[PDB]
Symmetry: C3
Subunit: 332 residues, 3 copies
């Protein structure tokens, strides 16, 4: 059974088919690719865009989405095997996945890491559990990667440059400030999709500590090697933004500090200047700027940049809807 866990599991031709079909849905939003069909959207963390775009996407295609929130309405779910379940979890993912399998045609899941031990978070236990026990296709709605955002971001870029071939473009994935440490998911996904598109990627971040998990650095290299692009890690703002075509900001907690965020506080606080403002954007090749959102103004990016005509954040958010309808349609 084919799932949509990461874009890395898909061939360039399959992904390309997805984007084109997404572009097709954007011109003809109503359809019947999901008539009488339904999808279970399971959320273990908040969401505005993902929840809304999927719920609407399923409706516009003749289907119906059932939104579940383990712990708020549905029963909390246990993921570990061979365990005496006398704790806070009343049922196991093995049952939950098989049960949903008899009701819905697709299962979407959102589960951010717990931030206590990256060794445990990097395993993607939730997504992998669903994909293992579910008799129906599973869709990643963001765990430690955000593949749906990738395709929304990618489509938005091609649309901006009026071409599907983004090779030779200078892509800058910059870390940005935030009072607290966040998920690396969106970053791992951006690095993955930008290198898969074959762009000249620079991972701008404060210190080596902030470099993404090796897994994605490796996926990125394999992508560069295959698409003819390039990868590069920079700790210098100006040399990074210089002549950039795209600038994607996202804040995240330094991996080496999982479970020990105390000393991480004083470190991130001394890099607030990483904020994406006009100065840095002026150094770009009239480049574009985006963010997966939700975005904090005057923290991650200044008001002037968000309101700038060069900001394609709203278009990227919109394509989430089209891109996901292409995925669901392709999975049923």
């Amino acid at each position: 059974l084919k799932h949509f866990l990461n874009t890395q599991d898909w061939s360039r031709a399959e992904l390309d088919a997805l984007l084109t079909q997404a572009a097709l849905f954007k011109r003809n939003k109503l359809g019947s690719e999901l008539k009488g069909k339904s999808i279970a959207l399971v959320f273990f963390n908040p969401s505005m865009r993902t929840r809304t775009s999927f719920e609407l996407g399923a409706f516009q295609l003749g289907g119906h989405a059932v939104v579940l929130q383990p712990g708020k309405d549905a029963w909390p779910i246990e993921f570990n095997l061979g365990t005496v379940m006398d704790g806070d979890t009343p049922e196991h993912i093995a049952e939950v996945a098989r049960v949903l399998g008899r009701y819905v045609d697709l299962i979407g899941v959102r589960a951010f890491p717990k931030f206590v031990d990256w060794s445990k978070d990097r395993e993607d236990q939730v997504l992998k559990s669903f994909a293992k026990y579910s008799p129906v296709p599973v869709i990643n709605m963001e765990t430690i990667t955000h593949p749906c955002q990738e395709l929304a971001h990618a489509l938005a870029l091609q649309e901006h440059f009026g071409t599907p071939d983004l090779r030779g473009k200078k892509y800058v994935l910059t870390w940005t400030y935030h009072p607290k440490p966040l998920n690396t998911a969106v970053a791992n996904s951006a690095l993955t999709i930008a290198t898969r598109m074959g762009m000249d990627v620079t991972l701008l971040c404060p210190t080596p500590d902030y470099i993404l998990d090796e897994r994605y650095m490796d996926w990125a290299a394999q992508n560069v090697a295959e698409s003819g692009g390039s990868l590069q890690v920079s700790h210098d703002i100006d040399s990074a933004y210089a002549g950039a075509d795209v600038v994607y900001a996202k804040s995240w907690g330094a991996l080496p500090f999982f479970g020990n965020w105390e000393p991480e506080k004083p470190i991130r606080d001394q890099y607030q200047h990483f904020i994406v403002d006009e100065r840095k954007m002026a150094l770009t090749n009239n480049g574009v700027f985006s963010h997966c959102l939700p975005l904090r103004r005057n923290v991650k990016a200044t008001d002037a940049v968000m309101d700038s005509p060069n900001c394609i954040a709203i278009d990227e958010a919109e394509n989430r809807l089209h891109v996901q309808k292409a995925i669901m349609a392709a999975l049923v």
Copy 2:
């Protein structure tokens, strides 16, 4: 772009068209005025009637409603401008409104005041923010006014008297008891719609402190002046109910006590007799009684009154469904 923020922004002819179309939907509930269309219902406070009537109204018209609750599922939203967003709000209404604008065709919003400073609450920051940044029509689901209730209430009255012309009817908007201070919204809306219908309106309330904000007292005067009705403030129960045709109860916190409810407690507690019971209703001209609901029995009104055949509360609640389908249909 035309919105439905308050009935005061609409002409008498437009409002009349709304009520008639609502009466038309009441005879033919299923339609296609919203086929393939959707609406984002954003709730910052609880709701049973509004949430249900809108969700159903959108369905019965071929559309789909997406219910969002900032803080429970969607991300909390910031409304102030030029602020360093390092607080509890992860994203700004400027983005949220533009994003929803790419997904849904209509946006409904519910946001009661915070009760700390009426000077800030009376500004209607949430509703105005949505209407400012949203590329699609916005609908007031209750903030400091409850226009949807107004039209449901109005339709219910015309239906009761078998006529659209309510002029010359004695309308009594009475304050009523409640262990705590509430929103003036429903009251401000009742005063507005009753004076706009050209009835003889009396605002019965305990003391001058309980008189509604000048804004609505002024809207009411302009309405009297235009419809030929009348406005009047009374602190005497019997002289108010006397020969009334309609009696609308609603409890609210004295505006001058926002942020300082301590001394408000002892004041409201000495006016529990304002409860709408049989005695007061007997003094009426066999008048009708209603309440926007949720209503607390034996506090706001006695069981005998609620169960009375003169109580049209349930019909008013029902018309919410028809009246809102007329608004959505008119806005797309």
Copy 3:
């Protein structure tokens, strides 16, 4: 007006019609028995299966389900009569039921007991209040009985044995361990449906204290007397499982300990061996095993049993969907 509060209120012919229609829906899931229709699903407790199966069932039949959760989104609801509502409940079920009555065509309700006083819980105040004030058919989504589970369980059994006639089968309803005391609902329902099907029922439980409320023991006797089956209470594991055809596990708090669970703790803890493992299942006549779910692994049943080909828990969960579509279709 006909409701679906308990299977006991329905004749054997009506119930049989329900199961057959459920079997019919299972072959033809999409229909129009609910076109333009809607149902209000009111939840006072968590739910994954019930909420999902009903929401989907309504969709697959052309209708729409509105999920309400008094206290989370909708306003909390008061059920006592002639009370001064100055507490935590803003509105009364008399209004809530009549209001929903003007919006939806059906009302489903879930409300577990409070576990403080069984004398009050056994009254089924919530379900009875809805059925009393609602102008439209009411459906029990589990209170002190779980009739929907009954029919899902029953259908799953007939399907397993390839016949609708379950008479002469040895049915074992066994209590099982759980760190805390639970609702007897599923148990009361199993005892009811198994005796109504005319099987040889044994209620295996630790001590006499754990025997179900007399009401259901009585319903069971009347059912035995009518169907030709049998009822029997056993406190011995091996004599119970011996040659069983069906084994239904469910944990519950000893009724005589409501409001006084302290001493109940040490009592249930000394019966953990009641867990449904392979040994006990080996003593059966190659019997089947099920559980209403959510089920805690290695507490209520071992992993080996849940994963066993003899476990029909997932099928029972699926039939919830078909069985409820048959009920809704029959009630409109």
